[model samples]
Target chain A: GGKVQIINKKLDLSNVQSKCGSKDNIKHVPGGGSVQIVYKPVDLSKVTSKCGSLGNIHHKPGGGQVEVKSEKLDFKDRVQSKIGSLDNITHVPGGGNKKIETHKLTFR
Target chain B: GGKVQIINKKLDLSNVQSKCGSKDNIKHVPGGGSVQIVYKPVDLSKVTSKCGSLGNIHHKPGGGQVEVKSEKLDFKDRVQSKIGSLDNITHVPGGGNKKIETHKLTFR
Candidate 1:
């Protein structure tokens, strides 16, 4: 099968799947086109996600899915999103926050 | 527009763009289903990406594109991909390396 190794993060993916998030997920505006990342598990929780849907994407312990969407995110060239635990999601200047709901990752 | 705000990562998007890596970007197996993420901008590189194509998805300055692919990426539920610079792509146990190629990002 196809799996990824992003330097430090190791995923089991034994129980997880991936997708494109959504079609409305992208918007072309001033900066460029903003892309949206949404995760769906029929319930949407505990993991990042693929484009739209695959099946079940759980590869690690306590590993879940998180969605990353952008609004006028200003991509002069390109933008990006990633799925991991609180440790995997990050930025350049580096410094953000995490919100959680009952079981859903709320918003990443 | 419908953008997202993660915990730490900040994007200029002023010169960057964003998207889902690929359609064939996912696979299902033991762990789950493996997902494959490949970026194609006619010439694939300098950027992560959306599903397949959008047009000229450059929104952030100095930002290009990077593709994330998961082989048997495990999706007992769902998986995901992101676009950004070397700094943007990350993993949890945290410590992935960057591989750069000429006009395009060799492969993220």
Candidate 2:
């Protein structure tokens, strides 16, 4: 078995190598604009999810004491906007209507 | 001022629309192969960073009490492999040396 623990850490992986021997930077920005995006379909029906936790405890003998509770961690992931597609109908110069595909791009 | 708090969460942004009325999927798989990627250079020398924290505390009375501390958060960002570039000098079929830009692609 293996162990993986991550707390208040920034995982930066930039200048990664690519096929062309050129360095590439990958970013996953959520709710950000999707101007340069590629499409692919996948099936997740067979995927299963599981989770667990770990901890420890101790005690001390004393009289008067103080307590405190605080948090100072900032985890920021990227963002992307909403996406919608529609079938557009265009009228030919003469008569018939041509069905065209239209995509709407907007960020949140 | 605004407040942002993100703890033990998975940020997923997929099926985003694009210019061609197509639903696009974006993924940042660190250390994953870089078969498809675009490149751009930016200057980060002028960026400044600042950090802060917030919290509170209270007192409790007890004698034969037990204590416990634990953490159950899994933050898995992407991973990337090393990147290196070089000028590939090749000898022409006849004589002179030809410089060709080559990129090496590998994933972590």
Candidate 3:
């Protein structure tokens, strides 16, 4: 039984209007720009055998504001040894906004 | 007969000097930023066949100091699709440094 879905391989709107640095005209807060693609070796007992008792998961890229509230459906699995940390946002031209916070994985 | 050469990918120096998370002046270090581009798919046997036995190959971006010294040119190849990881530094504004060390490759 194989059924796992998480796709958005590509769609980088170049500089998405610019700003963060101030060329101005960088406005995105309605739908607020979107990009979510997670398809690495993730199974986790078929997502906890089907969504139950799962929480604590957050990802913020680009605009830098992610508040995730999970009661279930927060599945993660890719273990040889592991820790945590993942946050990335990049958009630097004349404008600016680059934030990458990741480093907390220990697997030997 | 075949030969290969690598080149700088592109020039990116947007928010070269914002805060870790603030709005301020963004300045880059002199000759401070550059990107190297390799069109992927490299061969080693051909490289080793010509060059002397190698030493180490190092790289850095953003602000991490990289010291590379060798009397010989270095070479590395891929293998499970062998393990591989590289460094990436991106800047964001008003301006600041954002460094990234990739997650190791574990092919199983």
Candidate 4:
């Protein structure tokens, strides 16, 4: 129940129904997808990496969570994923399982 | 020794000291920074979520790791982070601590 307004993008997550699971069950195969954005270049120097079942993966690096009340954010590129659940199969950065709505998202 | 070529960006991670610690130590406060990308809008619907310390944080939807041998990639935006380490104080997407060299990276 929140909203994140970044740059010029608005995401009303108030009714987003956020949920998660204790274990990762979903599997996301990138295959050969591509993503094009229209924001600033995000620095991954502080991002974290791990050796998962596939190979070396990366994550946010570190930091806790924050509850937003539909706040507005700047425009660059902030990474956002869904909650973990048995019904929600996907991959987690670094390692784990989860699902992805789509591999290729053309933001521009 | 690996390289990820995405869109028109080239990254040489060879000799890039890859390491991580079991614990997160670094702290990255966005303060009032921003990230602007020129790639497609990454679909996070399938991405997982978690209720962490701050509040709600997102991460990579799913999938394992892969080894890139300095191969050339297409013109799109690909998410890439750094390895983790106690000395590397930073913030992870889901939850954890690590260090980030910089929070804002302007890639155009």
In model 2, the runs with Cα more than 4 Å from the true position are: A1-55, A73-108, B1-108
lDDT (0-100) at residue A22 of candidate 2? Answer: 15
- Candidate 4: stretches off by over 4 Å: A1-37, A40-43, A48-108, B1-68, B76-108
- lDDT tens digits, residue span A1-108, model 3: 122232322222222121232211213211111212121321121101111111222221223333343333332333232113222323243323345443334455
Candidates by TM-score, descending order: 2, 3, 1, 4
What class would a CAPRI assessor give candidate 3's docking?
Answer: incorrect
Summarize candidate 2's per-residue lDDT along A1-105 as a digit string, tens digits: 222343433333222211221123235432111223322122111111111211221223344544444433233323232224212211112223233222323
lDDT of 4 at A85: 19
lDDT of 1 at A27: 28
The C-alpha stretches of model 1 lying farther than 4 A from their native spots are: A1-33, A39-80, A83-108, B1-75, B86-108
Query: True interface contacts reproduced by each model, as a fraction?
Result: 0.04, 0.01, 0.04, 0.04
Cα lDDT of model 4 by residue, A28-68, tens digit = 22211121222333221232222111222233222343323
Cα lDDT for residue B27, model 1? Answer: 27
Where model 3 places Cα greater than 4 Å from the true spot, the runs are A1-100, B1-85, B88-108
What is candidate 2's CAPRI-style docking category based on DockQ? incorrect
Between prediction 3 and prediction 4, which has the larger TM-score? Answer: 3
> Every model's DockQ, to 2 decimals?
0.03, 0.02, 0.03, 0.03
